Amino acid sequence: APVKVFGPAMSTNVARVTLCLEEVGAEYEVVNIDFNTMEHKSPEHLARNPFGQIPAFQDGDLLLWESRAISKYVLRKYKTDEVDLLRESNLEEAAMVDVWTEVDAHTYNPALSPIVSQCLFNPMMRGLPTDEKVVAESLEKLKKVLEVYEARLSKHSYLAGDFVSFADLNHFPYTFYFMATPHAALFDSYPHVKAWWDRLMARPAVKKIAATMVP
Amino acid sequence: APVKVFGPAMSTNVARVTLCLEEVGAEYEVVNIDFNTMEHKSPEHLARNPFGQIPAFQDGDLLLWESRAISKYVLRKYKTDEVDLLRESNLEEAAMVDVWTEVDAHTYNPALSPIVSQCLFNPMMRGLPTDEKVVAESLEKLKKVLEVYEARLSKHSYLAGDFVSFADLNHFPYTFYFMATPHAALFDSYPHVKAWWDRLMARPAVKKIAATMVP
Ligand SMILES: N[C@@H](CCC(=O)N[C@@H](CS)C(=O)NCC(=O)O)C(=O)O
Ligand SMILES: N[C@@H](CCC(=O)N[C@@H](CS)C(=O)NCC(=O)O)C(=O)O
């Protein structure tokens, strides 16, 4: 059997999961879920995710939610010697995958996402005005985060060490949409961070998932 | 050598780390960091965490930050057959540790923390007024989250299955402080969730870390 990813393909936390499936060479199917008719809150979907949110995943009789959990089960399940992206076979490396995965979720995303969810995902999706207050602020916040990212990505090819990893792939979905805003040119001031970004956009798995993220 | 946890012991993300050390039987030391004199932003501390936040950890020459990453490196490092709390030896079990760990960070904590950080951690720590708006709202939000927790903890002794796990321990630190507010009696309406809470408070490792969380 293939395994099943439930949500719209456009969606960032879907793309986390789909990218991980592409990277690892997995048979998979994407089942839409129609926000506009509350399918995410429908009882079918609540049996996948009791909290009524996308994505959900099913591998036969196993039902998972929370894109990061899904992603890790996919990364351990289809692991090869050729494609170890969580590095659990090395403790110290596995730690620096955890750190930078956690940095994305707790530092970077909370400073980047609100600019995406204001320039792009507010008028084009929800038809809601853009808050210059929240934007100017997360933009200042993100310049300082990219200061730390620059330092790191000047010492290492990737966030976790000198190997692509789950830490890096996590950063792709929301950054992809960042790069569709006027603010994308921000990375031009962070040339190490930029080179690392251009590296990720060069991978056959990313080129593919990128193709799935349009209106 | 022992390993080193940097921040105040009172702090929730310190306690995540310290609890995990106690559970697993590890030699460790807690090095205070004095918020009041900006030690968390001092250059010594920035060499641990470049983002200037607690906790940080050092195991000899390894420097980690982000309590969840720290916690997992501690849980893999000191793992016994007697104390497997991430269950990486079982995929399906490891997935349901990831899910409920992610639920804490993305559903539960964001609905609980703002009541803690308003009734307790605002006037007693920052000397800041309590926002009835934000409280009433996260309280309604949390009642519905505890609906899902009740369902689950009526089917299973613990969040991940019929075994204590990293998912459960994650929920301890902020819930501990929840239980010091007027709102603690909320759990009385969620008797399964309550029994699971009383179970966690009964473990020798939790009784110990609880002792460290006072003014
Ligand atoms: N932490 C989750 C994020 C889930 C999420 O962002 N949920 C959104 C996706 S657009 C949603 O379905 N929100 C609708 C709602 O809960 O009302 C993950 O890692 O997948
Ligand atoms: N996601 C982090 C949370 C870190 C955190 O909450 N930082 C606080 C701890 S009280 C802090 O030091 N804030 C000060 C600042 O960054 O200005 C973890 O898992 O440890």
Numbering used by the authors:
A (entry chain AAA), B (entry chain AAA): 2 to 216
Give verbatim excerpts from the published study on this entry:
In spite of extensive crystallisation and soaking efforts, no crystal with any substrate bound or any alternative crystal packing forms of the wild-type protein were obtained. Based on a careful analysis of the crystal packing, the key hydrophobic contact stabilising a crystallographic dimer interface shown in Fig. 1b was identified and three protein variants were designed to facilitate alternative packing. The Phe122Tyr variant therefore adopted the closed conformation for the two loops over the binding cleft with glutathione bound in the G-site. Having identified new crystallisation conditions for the Phe122Thr variant, a similar approach was used in screening for the Tyr118Ser AmGSTF1 variant, with the structure determined to a resolution of 2.6 Å. Density was observed again associated with a glutathione molecule in the binding site, although this was refined with a reduced occupancy of 0.7. Interestingly, the Tyr118Ser mutation resulted in the top of the α4 helix becoming disordered, with the weak density observed for residues from Phe122 to Thr131 consistent with considerable flexibility. This suggests that interactions formed by this Tyr118 residue are essential to the structure of this helix and may explain the reduced enzymatic activity associated with the mutation of this residue.
